[PDB]
């Protein structure tokens, strides 16, 4: 992976994620929403396995976005967990958790779950 | 399990669940919300393993509630998945998924996830 991960990825709803994978396991970049805009850009940070297994297994990885930038504060954070699979049609398959900040009476319904696939195309 | 499951269970938020576990794996009963009321009662149905392992392993089980009765329709359904552990302080430990009916534009945020523990006390 490593060099295979570095680049631009797109998901099925129109979001774009740009990432550098550093030599000792660091992921750093930006996430931007549909429309695409100077103001839908948010910082991302995560970690990946820098020595994956040599059989046809995927590379495990994860990252976080807090939904606050200079134009907007949505009082929430999303984590994606998944694996990179390389080759002709490389993709990242993930499941995600989105938690909102709540009062204690509302805490039982604070978290949504879903899934995304990212491609280079 | 079986006879060990049959009865009244309570969770940490004040909800009450009454269940019969039938000889060949069926679970049937009612769920009622906090307050406790003739009008917060909903039908439940599920399945459990009727021949569990003889070591100290739990009994795996699951059930569903659709949130519609004669007084109220909330256009949603919850599934609980977990295991029964018996003995002096028996409990059922679960994780759950709540899906609302949505338009396709809203489908990415249709499902919440959380967790409950039920006791006989």
């Amino acid at each position: 992976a490593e060099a295979g991960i570095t680049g631009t990825w797109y998901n099925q709803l129109g979001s774009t994620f740009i990432v550098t994978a550093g030599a000792d396991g660091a992921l750093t970049g930006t996430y931007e929403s549909a429309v695409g805009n100077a103001e839908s850009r948010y910082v991302l940070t995560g970690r990946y396995d820098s020595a994956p297994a040599t059989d046809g297994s995927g590379t495990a990885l994860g990252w976080t976005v807090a939904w606050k930038n200079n134009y907007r504060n949505a009082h929430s954070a999303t984590t994606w967990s998944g694996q990179y699979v390389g080759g002709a049609e490389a993709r990242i398959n993930t499941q995600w958790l989105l938690t909102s900040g709540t009062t204690e009476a509302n805490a039982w319904k604070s978290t949504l779950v879903g899934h995304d696939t990212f491609t280079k195309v | 399990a079986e006879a060990g499951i049959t009865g009244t269970w309570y969770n940490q938020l004040g909800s009450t669940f009454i269940v019969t576990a039938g000889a060949d794996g069926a679970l049937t009963g009612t769920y009622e919300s906090a307050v406790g009321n003739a009008e917060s009662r909903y039908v439940l149905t599920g399945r459990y393993d009727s021949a569990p392992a003889t070591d100290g392993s739990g009994t795996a089980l699951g059930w569903t509630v659709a949130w519609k009765n004669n007084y109220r329709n909330a256009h949603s359904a919850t599934t609980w998945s977990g295991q029964y552990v018996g003995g002096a302080e028996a409990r059922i430990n679960t994780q759950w998924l709540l899906t609302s009916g949505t338009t396709e534009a809203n489908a990415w945020k249709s499902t919440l996830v959380g967790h409950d523990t039920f006791t006989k006390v």
Partner: peptide, 8 residues
């Protein structure tokens, strides 16, 4: 309209 969703 949460920023994770489409659009905005």
């Amino acid at each position: 309209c949460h920023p994770q969703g489409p659009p905005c």
